[PDB]
Structures are given as structure tokens and as C-alpha cells.
Motif scaffolding. Structure first.
Motif, short mmCIF file in Angstrom:
data_model
loop_
_atom_site.label_atom_id
_atom_site.label_comp_id
_atom_site.label_asym_id
_atom_site.label_seq_id
_atom_site.Cartn_x
_atom_site.Cartn_y
_atom_site.Cartn_z
N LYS A 160 1.92 -40.45 -20.48
CA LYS A 160 0.77 -39.94 -19.72
C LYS A 160 -0.36 -39.55 -20.66
CE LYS A 160 -0.59 -36.14 -16.69
NZ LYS A 160 -0.05 -35.13 -15.73
N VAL A 161 -1.58 -39.93 -20.30
CA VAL A 161 -2.77 -39.49 -21.03
C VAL A 161 -3.39 -38.36 -20.22
CG1 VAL A 161 -4.98 -40.15 -22.00
CG2 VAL A 161 -3.08 -41.76 -22.06
N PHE A 162 -3.37 -37.15 -20.76
CA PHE A 162 -3.93 -36.00 -20.05
C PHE A 162 -5.45 -35.98 -20.12
CE2 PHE A 162 -0.68 -32.92 -18.75
CZ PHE A 162 0.46 -33.48 -19.31
N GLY A 163 -6.07 -35.44 -19.07
CA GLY A 163 -7.43 -34.96 -19.19
C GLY A 163 -7.47 -33.63 -19.93
N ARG A 164 -8.64 -33.33 -20.51
CA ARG A 164 -8.81 -32.11 -21.29
C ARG A 164 -8.42 -30.87 -20.49
NH1 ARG A 164 -13.26 -28.71 -21.73
NH2 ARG A 164 -14.49 -30.15 -20.43
N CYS A 165 -9.03 -30.68 -19.32
CA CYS A 165 -8.74 -29.48 -18.53
C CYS A 165 -7.35 -29.51 -17.93
CB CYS A 165 -9.80 -29.30 -17.44
SG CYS A 165 -11.43 -29.01 -18.11
N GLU A 166 -6.85 -30.70 -17.59
CA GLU A 166 -5.50 -30.81 -17.07
C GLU A 166 -4.49 -30.33 -18.10
OE1 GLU A 166 -4.24 -34.80 -16.58
OE2 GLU A 166 -2.66 -34.26 -15.13
N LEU A 167 -4.67 -30.74 -19.35
CA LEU A 167 -3.77 -30.30 -20.40
C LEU A 167 -3.91 -28.80 -20.65
CD1 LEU A 167 -1.66 -30.91 -22.48
CD2 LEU A 167 -3.53 -31.36 -24.10
N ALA A 168 -5.15 -28.31 -20.69
CA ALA A 168 -5.35 -26.88 -20.89
C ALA A 168 -4.59 -26.08 -19.84
CB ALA A 168 -6.84 -26.54 -20.84
N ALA A 169 -4.67 -26.49 -18.58
CA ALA A 169 -3.98 -25.74 -17.54
C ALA A 169 -2.46 -25.86 -17.68
CB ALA A 169 -4.44 -26.22 -16.17
N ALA A 170 -1.97 -27.03 -18.07
CA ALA A 170 -0.53 -27.17 -18.29
C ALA A 170 -0.06 -26.31 -19.46
CB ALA A 170 -0.18 -28.64 -18.53
N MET A 171 -0.83 -26.27 -20.55
CA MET A 171 -0.44 -25.45 -21.69
C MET A 171 -0.49 -23.97 -21.35
SD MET A 171 -2.19 -27.38 -24.84
CE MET A 171 -1.25 -28.54 -25.83
N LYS A 172 -1.49 -23.56 -20.58
CA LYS A 172 -1.58 -22.16 -20.16
C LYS A 172 -0.38 -21.76 -19.32
CE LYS A 172 -4.54 -18.82 -17.85
NZ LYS A 172 -5.91 -18.27 -17.99
N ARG A 173 0.01 -22.63 -18.37
CA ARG A 173 1.18 -22.35 -17.54
C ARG A 173 2.44 -22.19 -18.37
NH1 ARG A 173 5.09 -24.86 -14.49
NH2 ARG A 173 4.48 -27.01 -15.05
N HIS A 174 2.54 -22.93 -19.47
CA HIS A 174 3.71 -22.87 -20.32
C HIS A 174 3.61 -21.80 -21.39
CE1 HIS A 174 4.69 -26.87 -18.55
NE2 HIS A 174 5.92 -26.45 -18.76
N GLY A 175 2.59 -20.95 -21.34
CA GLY A 175 2.53 -19.76 -22.16
C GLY A 175 1.90 -19.93 -23.53
N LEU A 176 1.11 -20.98 -23.75
CA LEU A 176 0.52 -21.17 -25.07
C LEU A 176 -0.75 -20.38 -25.31
CD1 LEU A 176 0.99 -24.92 -25.91
CD2 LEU A 176 2.15 -22.95 -26.93
N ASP A 177 -1.44 -19.92 -24.27
CA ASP A 177 -2.66 -19.15 -24.49
C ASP A 177 -2.36 -17.85 -25.21
OD1 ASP A 177 -5.42 -18.60 -24.48
OD2 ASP A 177 -5.45 -17.97 -22.37
N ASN A 178 -2.93 -17.72 -26.41
CA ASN A 178 -2.72 -16.60 -27.31
C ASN A 178 -1.30 -16.52 -27.83
OD1 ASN A 178 -5.43 -15.82 -26.83
ND2 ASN A 178 -4.75 -14.81 -24.94
#
Length: 129
Positions: A1-19
Motif C-alpha cells: 500500500k502507498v499511503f497518503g501523507r495525512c492518511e499515514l499521519a493518522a495511522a501513526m497517531k492511532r498507533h501511539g507514535l506522536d511524541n
């Protein structure tokens, strides 16, 4: 899968990567952009015979088993092919172990050379997060 920029950001945030370990979301999106161009199926072979896998180009020398990197370690306890899934859970869980290893996101050469010290929040501007 090739993610969109915001799609990946939201997936990473859901998985706890923000900060996660102090690294804001933009750092992780920037690293994925330059490591894999947001493509979960990216692979690249290294000179030592190891291979980098997936959206964050996690290396088989230390982190996953691909059956062809002799004397390597499998610290994330996963086959490297698990890192190529459209589901980024395995890549994220392994990335969390890498970034906690002591060297932070310097483990990712593209992050060091292309994201570190830049306006990384640019990578999440405009996204609904």
C-alpha cells in the motif's frame, strides 16, 4: 500500500507514535516519506547483505528475520515480510523498540539527513488529526 501523507499521519497517531520518546508526529511522517516514499512494500538491499523492509525501512541485521542475513539478530521477533503489510502495526511496534535503543531516530539515516533540524511539522499540516 502507498499511503497518503495525512492518511499515514493518522495511522501513526492511532498507533501511539506522536511524541513517542519525544519525537513529534511530523518526524515519523518525514522519515517514512524519505525512507520508503510511503510505500509499505519498499525493500532495499544493503552492502553487508542485509535488507531494509517496509515503510520505515527496518533492517534485517538487527530487527527482523528474513532467512538470508547470516549471523543477524531478530530483535523485533518478527519475519521481515510482516513489515511489508498494508497494516503498519508491526512496523510501528518494531520502530518503537528501535527508537528506544539509545540512538533515537538517528537509527534512520534519511531522518538524520533530511528531517532532523527541519520544519517537520510541515509533514502534518492540513491533516485532520
Amino acid at each position: 500500500k502507498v499511503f497518503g501523507r495525512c492518511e499515514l499521519a493518522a495511522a501513526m497517531k492511532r498507533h501511539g507514535l506522536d511524541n513517542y520518546r519525544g519525537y513529534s508526529l511530523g518526524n515519523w511522517v518525514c522519515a517514512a516519506k524519505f525512507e520508503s516514499n510511503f510505500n509499505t512494500q519498499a525493500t532495499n538491499r544493503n552492502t553487508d547483505g542485509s535488507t531494509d523492509y517496509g515503510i520505515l525501512q527496518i533492517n534485517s541485521r538487527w530487527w527482523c528475520n528474513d532467512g538470508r542475513t547470516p549471523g543477524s539478530r531478530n530483535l523485533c521477533n518478527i519475519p521481515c515480510s510482516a513489515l511489508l503489510s498494508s497494516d503498519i502495526t508491526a512496523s510501528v511496534n518494531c520502530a518503537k523498540k528501535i527508537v528506544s535503543d539509545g540512538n533515537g531516530m538517528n537509527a534512520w539515516v534519511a531522518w538524520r539527513n533530511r528531517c532532523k533540524g527541519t520544519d517537520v511539522q510541515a509533514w502534518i499540516r492540513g491533516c485532520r488529526l
